[PDB]
Design a protein around this ligand. Structure first.
Ligand code: HEM
Ligand SMILES: N[C@@H](Cc1c[nH]c2ccccc12)C(=O)O
Ligand SMILES: [C-]#N
Length: 350
């Protein structure tokens, strides 16, 4: 059914299969050291594979991304024990900045590095803690990432489709089907991840670190480019400053291509503004307009089926303080309000 996922999953698998620093067996030793809070041992382990002579000249994006992944788990870990990794590992910060340059991404690990770029096998998967709850957490993101990327592409495609065309209803139906994966992610997370273990044992690994005279956020599903999708779909012309700050916050953490998608659509009418202006000019007596708007309403419905239970998941965890993305769960309530208002505009048009 979801025939567009494959190419995205294949691009991730290429980084997941890469071990350019031959660090697999070394990184597996990291959970035990974290459990023991052995900060010197964590540093010594990292130094067994950290490049000291600069990056190998034949590396491409894949090798540099994979190297950032493997060094990256040591970054969150060190900070978890109360230490800036750059301050306790000499020669580390230049390597992190060279990897940022090679990948056009920040100089630490992101969500991409620790989930879809991270091999899945028990004898290869990297992890801060080695806990089952961390494994399910990574899996919850693997469920929807590739499908979300397909959904961004469909949203961009749909933006150039006329509401008068039968293609509009068909593309929106397809979009809705990919976005359903976000719902499946939250259902999985609610079923398999203990909020207690998350807050007490996992959350401490996602604090910010200082590199290059600024602060970089730790990994979190908040870095998934859903905000880019919705910037295009409904939020590009929003005048809510809190919302605009939220989106701009995560922009550095998404793939370069999605920063460029975001830039392309900023300060211009969102898909739904255009769709709704078209509906107003042409009338809902046009059968394709009616079907298009109905299909579009189902897209917002699925966004809400993600967002509302995600808010409960988040509050239940903070029922045991802000996320790794730097927000309290109250900002989640604000984004939900905006999403309901966007859906309401669509349903009022019908
Ligand atoms: C126990 C698991 C989770 C907790 C406690 C949690 C909590 C949070 C928090 C506190 C935020 C605000 C940003 C921050 O400060 O980090 C956030 C944002 C966000 N999270 Fe989660 N989250 C969890 C799992 C997930 C999962 C599994 C997904 C999807 C695969 C997800 C997707 C998002 C998205 C897309 C945002 C941006 C806000 C939005 O789109 O509504 N989260 N989450
Ligand atoms: N950002 C949320 C949840 C989170 C942290 N790290 C993650 C990694 C993957 C998925 C979700 C998360 C928090 O800090 O509470
Ligand atoms: C959700 N981070």
């Amino acid at each position: 059914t979801l025939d567009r996922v494959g190419v995205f999953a294949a691009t991730h698998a290429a980084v997941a299969a890469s071990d350019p620093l031959q660090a697999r067996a070394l990184v597996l030793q990291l959970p035990g050291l974290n459990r023991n809070k052995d900060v010197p041992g964590i540093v010594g382990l990292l130094r067994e594979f950290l490049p000291v002579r600069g990056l190998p000249s034949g590396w491409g994006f894949v090798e540099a991304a994979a190297a950032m992944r493997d060094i990256g788990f040591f970054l969150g870990s060190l900070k978890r024990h109360g230490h800036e990794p750059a301050e306790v590992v000499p020669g580390l910060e230049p390597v992190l900045l060279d990897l940022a340059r090679a990948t056009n991404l920040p100089p630490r690990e992101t969500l991409l590095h620790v989930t879809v770029w991270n091999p899945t096998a028990a004898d290869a998967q990297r992890s801060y803690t080695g806990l089952p709850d961390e494994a399910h957490l990574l899996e919850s993101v693997r469920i929807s990432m590739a499908a979300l990327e397909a959904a961004i592409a469909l949203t961009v495609e749909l933006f150039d489709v006329s509401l008068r065309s039968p293609e509009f209803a068909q593309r929106s139906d397809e979009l809705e089907a990919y976005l359903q994966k976000m719902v499946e992610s939250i259902v999985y997370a609610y079923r398999f991840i203990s909020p207690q273990v998350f807050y007490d044992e996992l959350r401490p690994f996602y604090e910010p670190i200082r590199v290059g005279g600024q602060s970089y956020l730790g990994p979190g599903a908040v870095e998934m480019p859903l905000f880019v999708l919705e910037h295009v779909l409904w939020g590009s012309q929003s005048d809510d400053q809190t919302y605009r700050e939220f989106k701009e916050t995560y922009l550095p953490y998404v793939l370069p291509a999605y920063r460029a998608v975001y830039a392309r659509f900023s300060g211009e009418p969102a898909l739904i503004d255009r769709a709704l202006d078209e509906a107003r000019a042409v009338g809902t007596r046009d059968e394709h307009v009616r079907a298009g708007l109905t299909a579009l309403e189902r897209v917002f419905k699925v966004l809400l089926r993600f967002r509302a239970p995600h808010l409960k998941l988040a509050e239940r965890a903070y029922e045991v303080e802000i996320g790794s993305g730097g927000y309290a769960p109250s900002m989640l309530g604000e984004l939900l309000t905006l999403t309901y208002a966007a859906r309401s505009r669509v349903r009022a048009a019908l």
